[model samples]
Target chain A: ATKAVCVLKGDGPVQGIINFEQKESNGPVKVWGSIKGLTEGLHGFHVHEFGDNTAGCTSAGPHFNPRRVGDLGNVTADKDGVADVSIEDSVISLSGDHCIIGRTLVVHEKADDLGKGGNEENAGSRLACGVIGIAQ
Target chain B: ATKAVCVLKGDGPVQGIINFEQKESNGPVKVWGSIKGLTEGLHGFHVHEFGDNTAGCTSAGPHFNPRRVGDLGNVTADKDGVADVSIEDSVISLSGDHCIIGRTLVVHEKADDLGKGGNAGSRLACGVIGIAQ
Candidate 1:
């Protein structure tokens, strides 16, 4: 099995740990994590194109693959401002040409309309982010 | 300029952030960061070959390019259990064939002997670490 992990960090008390695991190469990826310091609401969670954060989340570029792994939808935070996320995506993999290593995991301030929002409505600001990397 | 940042995380409160920046491609990299939750002592710091943490720090493999970026030596945590590190390395870069992106930044449980320890003695076990991808 192959796995990857990302450590989410931001300017304030916002922080989290996300883990990705695949049973085999080119297999479905199971994503799970816990994030803290968010407002009580739904937040958009998606993968961005670049691992570079030189200019903070802005440097991470746009949604990775836009049509594929970028639209995982929203994760809701509770009253204490914490989000526990669990997802299984067959479109993403641990190995292969479409591998997601070196990508950016971004959490947004608002809900994702899943493209139906068009340009009129968006996921809002990038709240926190982390670079995804190979894991044991 | 090119820059990369690593968010170090481990069991408990062992966590920190490290940033690497190069003035230009193939140029030197400036490494700096603040790490907390360490005992008051010197600890080994180096870049490991793999970012894998499947089996915890043990899966990160050995030092990356042992003769180059791997031998970064030690970082001393203060009595309050914090280590503010600053390092300038001309041997490393942000881009080029030897770019450090996707590598693992490792903190050790003990001070590095700077290779003099030989196989008889090592830098001890790998402590908290983060992978920069």
Candidate 2:
């Protein structure tokens, strides 16, 4: 199955399109995109629980799996404010009951410490978000 | 031909996608999209000549027609900072020689005077036009 997700802006200069692919059930999900309008550094990236925009990206809830599966790590942006994301995640699937479709993919303000910062290694404010949708 | 155009923000709270549709050659183009993070009111909307962002939206050049066909009028944003754009124009096409396949869609910082204000308009946010499914 294929999911063509477009990352809409939240409250920043961030924008891009991310595509997810899963060849079969229980397969690793591949992610790729060219995200722009970012500082020349690392930033947190993850899948959140809801596609809610009620309070901007704040209402999207915490990371998916309530914690782990959503931790996709960081994406580095170049000087021109562009970040090219290419990731293959095993825990996140694009099909089945728990598929990430309809959920929210968020780009945070700061780099994710991956818990190394002792909870202080946090992914800051949500900069941009988009819903995962089926695409042909 | 169908042009699923997505509007990528430049440097603001704006985010949305606008799609372009043309049933046949020389036909009017139908446009639609849900743009977010705008102040409550009307703003200038136009198809710029180039998709250049070398100096932000300033590099996109003047309005698409450089004068006329690019004058798409204004988009009204509600209190929620969202503007739903739905326009049908005869001059803009999705296919053919003058097709706007790789231009720039600009949301101005203020309302488009439609030439009424002489020449006082600015781009608040902009996105490079792209082919969509």
Candidate 2 RMSD computed on C-alpha atoms after optimal superposition onto the true structure: 11.1
**Could you tell me how far off, in angstroms, the CA of residue A19 lies in candidate 2 after the best superposition?**
0.8
Per-residue lDDT of model 1, residues A20-113, tens digit only: 9999886789999899999998889988877755556777788877356666778889999999999998887755655666667889988987
Q: Which ten residues in a row have the lowest lDDT in candidate 1 chain A?
A: A94-103
| Clashing pairs for predicted structure model 2, backbone only | none
TM-score of chain A of 1: 0.90
The lDDT values for all models are: 0.72, 0.72
* lDDT (Cα, tens digit) per residue for candidate 2, span A1-136: 6543444567878887777778877878889887899998999998887644445677668788733777789999999989999999888876554557546678989998887876542678889876554333
Tell me the TM-score of chain B in each candidate: 0.82, 0.89
- Per-prediction TM-score, please? 0.61, 0.50
Model 2 residue runs over 4 Å out of place are: A118-121, B1-133
Q: What does DockQ give for each predicted structure?
A: 0.18, 0.03
Docking class of 1: incorrect
Q: Give stretches of model 1 more than 4 Å off.
A: A118-121, B1-45, B49-101, B106-114, B117-133
